[model samples]
Target chain A: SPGIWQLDCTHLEGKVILVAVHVASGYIEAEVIPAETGQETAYFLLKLAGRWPVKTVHTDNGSNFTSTTVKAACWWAGIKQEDGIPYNPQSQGVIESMNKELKKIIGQVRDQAEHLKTAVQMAVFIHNHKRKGYSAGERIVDIIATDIQ
Target chain B: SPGIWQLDCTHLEGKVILVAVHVASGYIEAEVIPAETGQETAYFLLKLAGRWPVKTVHTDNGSNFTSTTVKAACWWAGIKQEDGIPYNPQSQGVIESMNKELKKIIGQVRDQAEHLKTAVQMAVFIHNHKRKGYSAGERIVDIIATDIQ
Candidate 1:
């Protein structure tokens, strides 16, 4: 029930997409949000808590994450919020790498006439289901299921 | 204790390297051999059988694989040798894809002052232990261990 997750945002087509990745399993979660505000990010984390046991979140020092709104949301959900260096991706490793992959997948889908939201959703689904492994060759989804259960 | 493995050969620096990939785990085994003859290929297979339970081996229609010497080796090791469509990569999917990756890795190593044989061995070692998985997100080496045990 204890794990560290990384959170970040990427902009595409004038919209912001919030992303989270489990460090150990590389499991990804992404959703299109209207804006990158603290309120919206906190809302997304609360929603995430309902789906997975988010014990701690490691994020970049963006206002959307460092603002009091996100801290309050984390307090309420029993989640801890920690900030990484302002622009150093190495501090927020997994999510940073995942964002690149997400963008690439979305770009590929867009070339084939897929809508943005649909592409983002499909990207998350594809990565979680496809052939990928963590340290011991365990699928991200499989590791999540077993680790939390 | 049964599994399907793919076998093929690639040329680099005027030497032939025999490559094998376990279809289920994507685990690779590669070695630089003097020649791609049936005798050498058979010897490689015999050595492979000692390390893993190789029940069936799928290979391209190269004369080295089709010759009586290779068949005799398989017979001695209780392995069934099957030939894929001549020159059609689809029939030997995993190895074909793996060879491309192997070449890419070897090329990267070659650029950094590594010997061809060392590069091939390191590539195989890297693929087996690093972040990669098979059908169920299982590491190739892990799958081989559990399947044969």
Candidate 2:
């Protein structure tokens, strides 16, 4: 919660996928955004804020990442917001690779559009579960497990 | 033929790694700069320009990506450069995931400091080899295997 978490958005099959990635660990969490607006950033932050209690959030200066509502959302949650280097997306490296893998994962199952709901669900499942050293799900689980202590 | 390519950089044990990812395809190329500066970007880009005749380059505006010299490097190559949304990082999702995998791969054998050369090399090898539709190596190999139309 004290680490600088990086967030970004990527599109899958024409739908927007909002994402957040931790800098220290490779843990990642992402969701689909139907509205494609800055408030969507607030929405995702609000949900994550419930448990993680973010310290500082880092992202580029995009409407979705930098709107007034998003600022207030972060302010209300007590999460300090920091913008990445003006033209250097690399400053927020944590989520960059996560977004690419999502596109790769979603492309694998795009053939069956009808099951997209569960498909999206399952896709995130595999994402959170599969990684180099650890899974985001277990990492997140471990966090909440230690939160009360 | 060139399109919009997303470039990003990450650090491993104080060394800087630069990468560029393709939008249409998950194809990628990367380099280790050891130095964290804008000049490193031009150095990495110089290698890439040899093969991929780029069109437009998209990145978040950082001094490294938006510096006066870097701008000329791209402009001199006849490639258009565009910045991603000011405060949002999702616009350049392609390179996000690519950098993360490099971290995982590097962590595996970070013990042998010298093997890092071969280590980074193999990381990229596995990176381009495993993907959604095709491996970047075989992806580009197939493209050039039977060319000259």
Candidate 3:
């Protein structure tokens, strides 16, 4: 969140957008929120709701992510909610890198940032489909197997 | 871009992903190439369909970024291109930051680095949008910017 740029782009040019990624499919979803009220989410719980059948979620220990509301939501979704080492950014690289990428684009288009939702949508649209056909664990395992041969 | 570059690392686990940024809008494009063949895109003249309509490109004199292929591509794009001051590391502040960010994430996920393209795509998708929040004039206008301002 750089400066919470509202539609008008007059002031506070930043916003908090939470991004989710499926470890297996690499499918991504970005949730845009102008204020704290927007941080509340269901963690895409239901079987076919938004994200893949999410089994786990790792996040920062910041009050924003660790709030009771977030924890409760994750639990209800049948998702394992856990916090990374306190203040350790490296551990939460998945979502951390995603946030920065989306945020930088928003910054680029902030001038024409017609609407936050559309920008997010346009970005996701362009980014969603790619060869994410595998997972990290699989990649490592495959490499190991390759080395064995 | 330097934003996608990195420093010390104890691994040969991943390949480089070339990145392009529109100087004016701060729009960014990232391409993952295991063989460094991606130094072949226009400043957005055609294949990019002028997505960002690049006007200029600035880079370091690194052996790769300064290669003949990269220069030919920039020249074909009818874009003004230049490398930073010889042996002067400071002029690369803009890209240096990006390379570090992307590279750090790459290292974080390198073990799971199944595919470079998807990682680059996912990273750029989430990293592109944010409050660039300022214009050419404002960003470098000698106007003191405070976190509060």
Candidate 4:
């Protein structure tokens, strides 16, 4: 079984920048690039995991994620790259929720007139530490377990 | 016939601060005191009309506004104090809208960690100059008759 990852995008100057999210733990790694191309996306994904075993990577059929460069990277890393069905993003629910939470925390930090990078860092910290989700009237920490030890 | 006035209370540190507005022009005036007493309200009412001729004043049935002190002030000023129907605040629509607008702008400013007083002043300026309404599509100054004769 391969590690499941999500590729998402955010906007700046009418251009999209890619972000990769760890599905289970809601851990996110983001980058600002000119465009979402297969080659560039492959480069980012490769850099995100160094010496770590990856079994599978899943993403929407965005042009960049589907590019030859990304496919080649996955093949080189002994990983399988899978594309979700067209126009169906519900398959990446973890990433979707992460995106919403990230935006909200970022918005709050930016409201304090903090630098964008600082806001992002603070938002990530708060999301990982302070924030809790509710289930059946009980607060629970959102976490993902990857290895069986 | 007496003219209508809109009144509403806003809370500041658990104290009820009253605001009176002219419905037609959206002009507002505020008062903050320890308590909303009839004597205090009467003094405030007298102070509200420094030299301007006030034929009528409209307010809700709050005990302070209906007290003997207020009535005496109204009688002395040759102004009629009209009470609106209980539980129906639609008569104070102008002030209600003003409060909403004030709160929205203030919230935005506070989120940015800006000075509250400056934000309030800016909100008032924007409301009077930038915002447009359906009945009157221009700035408030454009439609209001300037008593420059």
DockQ of 2: 0.01
Q: Model 2, which residues run further than 4 Å from truth?
A: A86-94, A111-117, A131-133, A140-149, B1-149
Docking class of 4: incorrect
- Cα DockQ of the candidate 3 complex: 0.01
lDDT of 3 at A114: 56
lDDT of each structure?
0.64, 0.58, 0.41, 0.52
lDDT of 1 by residue, B40-74 (tens): 78766765653445788887456956688788768
- Model 2: how far is A103 from its true place, Å? 1.0
Which residue pairs show collisions in model 1?
Answer: none
Candidate 1 global lDDT: 0.64
Give one digit per residue, the lDDT tens place, for model 2 in A1-149: 53557776776656777667665545555667675677667756754543343678876456745588788667756778886553566554545666777777766756633434334543554565564564554454344334423
Badly placed stretches (over 4 Å) of model 4 are A12-15, A86-89, A92-95, A111-118, A131-148, B1-149
- Error at A12, model 1, angstroms: 68
Count of backbone collisions within predicted model 1: 0
What TM-score, computed on C-alpha atoms, does each candidate reach?
0.45, 0.43, 0.35, 0.39
| Candidate 1 structure quality by residue, lDDT tens digits, A31-146 | 78778888778766765653445778876456856688778768756788877454755545655566787888878756532356655754665565455333221343344445
Better of 1 and 4 by TM-score: 1
